Design goal:
With 49 residues, the first copy, chain A, is mostly helical. Chain A is 63% helix and 0% strand. The longest helix of chain A has 18 residues. The radius of gyration of chain A is 14 Å and the shape is elongated. Chain A starts with 7 loop residues before the first helix and ends with a helix. Chains in contact: A-D, B-C, B-D, C-D. At the B-C interface, helix 1, strand 1 and strand 2 of B face strand 1, strand 4, strand 5, strand 6 and helix 1 of C. Strand 1 of chain B pairs antiparallel with strand 1 of chain C, so a sheet runs across the interface. It is classed as membrane protein. Keywords: calcium channel, membrane protein. Structure of dephosphorylated human RyR2 in the closed state.
Chain lengths: 49, 34, 97, 224
């Protein structure tokens, strides 16, 4: 209630970021230099947000 | 100077307030309150 | 003159006539136009309202002018006939809180 | 690399003559008090060894040859305030003085005149500029000499409070005396447009479209 409003534009941009990075992680684990763990951790955090 | 008899018989009293140079004077009011 | 003075600090003098209730103000040796007439038996407290724009704001000078008693003569009964100005420890500055 | 604003671009306005008045009378009065403090007294002849004054007289009796160069630092102190374009005005109470129109000089009181916070920052910048000017002249002089170093070569920020006391007291006295005259200085210009409704300027916005662009680029390079 103190503030910290997140704009609607900001949130569809967050959703598009989530979807596009999911597209990146699609079948690209081999190309990722073992950073798939970091990929899926960011997957979580954007999921909760 | 001042008349001693007039001072003995009068009932007029006086005080003064000096606003120091640098204190904005429109921000200062002087007078009496009840 | 107004505005900023730097010859000396502004001396605002308040004169009260306890027998007539006339309140007259003197600024830098001249009589101001503002005057007040009060009711009999009115008790008047010397007061200064100021907004601070300096480390030193103002001071209560308890002197006297020609043909007038000092404030201590009016305040204290024992000094009713003493023309010498005085500031006994009972008199002190109070503020609204 | 000090870079004071050039002063030849603009010129002094005419209405500031009355502000230069009373202030030259300051500089003379305080400096005559300094003369009394260190010992100078009247002589029709100037004697540096015998500690002798010819230049006591009221600023009116002081000649035109004095008037020049003596105000010159005052002229550049005024030029520094005008060149940045800071908006300066008068109250009509200020023109009240003009409409109302040996010798013992009057002791002139800086004691309780106080500045505002924005005006501090304002005068801190102008005194910082004065120091930048002054130090740039030292780098010219010492490079002409070809040798030596100076403790004050460090920037205004690096200088200590006692080292900066000179410029602080100069800035304070001048802006406080502009206070006493009632001139009012403020910011030079206001913003052409405040796009406060814009979500685009928010930090998260720019952060995300930078992310959008770079991650889209990365995605297409991963495709490649």
């Amino acid at each position: 209630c103190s503030g910290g409003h997140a704009s609607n534009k900001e949130k569809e941009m967050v959703t598009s970021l989530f979807c596009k990075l999911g597209v990146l992680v699609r079948h690209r684990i081999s190309l990722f230099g073992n950073d798939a763990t970091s990929i899926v951790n960011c997957l979580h955090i954007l999921g909760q947000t | 100077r001042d008349d001693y008899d007039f001072l003995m018989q009068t009932s007029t009293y006086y005080y003064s307030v000096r606003i120091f140079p640098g204190q904005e004077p429109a921000n200062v009011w002087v007078g009496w309150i009840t | 003159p107004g505005q900023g003075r730097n010859n000396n600090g502004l001396e605002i003098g308040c004169v009260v006539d306890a027998a007539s209730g006339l309140l007259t103000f003197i600024a830098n040796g001249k009589e101001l136009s503002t005057y007040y007439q009060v009711e009999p038996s009115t008790k008047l407290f010397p007061a200064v309202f100021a907004q601070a724009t300096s480390p030193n704001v103002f001071q209560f000078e308890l002197g006297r002018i020609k043909n007038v008693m000092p404030l201590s003569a009016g305040l204290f009964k024992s000094e009713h006939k003493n023309p010498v100005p005085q500031c006994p420890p009972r008199l002190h500055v109070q503020f609204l809180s | 690399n000090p870079q004071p604003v050039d002063t030849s671009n603009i010129t002094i306005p005419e209405k500031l003559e009355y502000f230069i008045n009373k202030y030259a009378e300051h500089s003379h009065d305080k400096w005559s008090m300094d003369k009394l403090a260190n010992g100078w007294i009247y002589g029709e002849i100037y004697s540096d060894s015998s500690k002798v004054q010819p230049l006591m007289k009221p600023y009116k009796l002081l000649s035109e040859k004095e008037k020049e160069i003596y105000r010159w630092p005052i002229k550049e102190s005024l030029k520094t305030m005008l060149a940045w374009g800071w908006r300066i005005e008068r109250t009509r109470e200020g023109d009240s003085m003009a409409l109302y129109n040996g010798y013992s000089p009057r002791a002139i009181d800086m004691s309780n005149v106080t500045l505002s916070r924005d005006l501090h920052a304002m005068a801190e910048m102008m005194a910082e500029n004065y120091h930048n000017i002054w130090a740039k002249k030292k780098k010219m002089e010492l490079e002409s000499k070809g040798g030596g170093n100076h403790p004050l070569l460090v920037p205004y920020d690096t200088l200590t409070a006692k080292e900066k006391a000179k410029d602080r007291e100069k800035a304070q006295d001048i802006l406080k005396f502009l206070q006493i005259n009632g001139y009012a200085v403020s910011r030079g210009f206001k913003d052409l447009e405040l796009d406060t409704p814009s979500i685009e300027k928010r930090f998260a916005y720019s952060f995300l479209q930078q992310l959008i662009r770079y991650v889209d680029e990365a995605h297409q390079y991963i495709l490649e």
